[PDB]
Design a protein around this ligand. Structure first.
Ligand SMILES: CC(=O)c1cccc(O)c1
Length: 115
């Protein structure tokens, strides 16, 4: 509260560490469904169903331009990618499996890096 401060995380390396995690996700072999925005003109139903599209290239642009105020907003956008994937794809499809795989991959890097 006012004039009563908690000790807080050293956050000075957060930007660089998130960038490294994102690089590891960008280069994963199962990243291909998530590298670019889904083409809303070519993919029936996506525009109406998925209220907040997100993809790795949009996250990278946002990270490179100071649009994440903290590491938690970065993780929210990453998770949104996989939450969207689950919404639109069956678990046993190729894209569906890729999403589960990439989510697992992310969360381990996230825990190992920050928790
Ligand atoms: C990420 C996703 O949900 C996707 C990507 C390409 C084609 C498609 O139908 C869906």
């Amino acid at each position: 509260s006012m004039s009563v401060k908690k000790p807080k995380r050293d956050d000075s390396k957060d930007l660089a560490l998130c960038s490294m995690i994102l690089t590891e996700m960008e280069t994963h072999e199962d990243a291909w469904p998530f590298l670019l925005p889904v083409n809303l003109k070519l993919v029936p139903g996506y525009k109406k169903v998925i209220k907040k599209p997100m993809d790795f290239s949009t996250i990278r642009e946002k990270l490179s331009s100071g649009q994440y105020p903290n590491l938690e907003t970065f993780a929210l956008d990453v998770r949104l990618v996989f939450d969207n994937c689950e919404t639109f794809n069956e678990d046993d499809s190729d894209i569906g499996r890729a999403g589960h795989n990439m989510r697992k991959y992310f969360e381990k890097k996230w825990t190992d890096t920050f928790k």
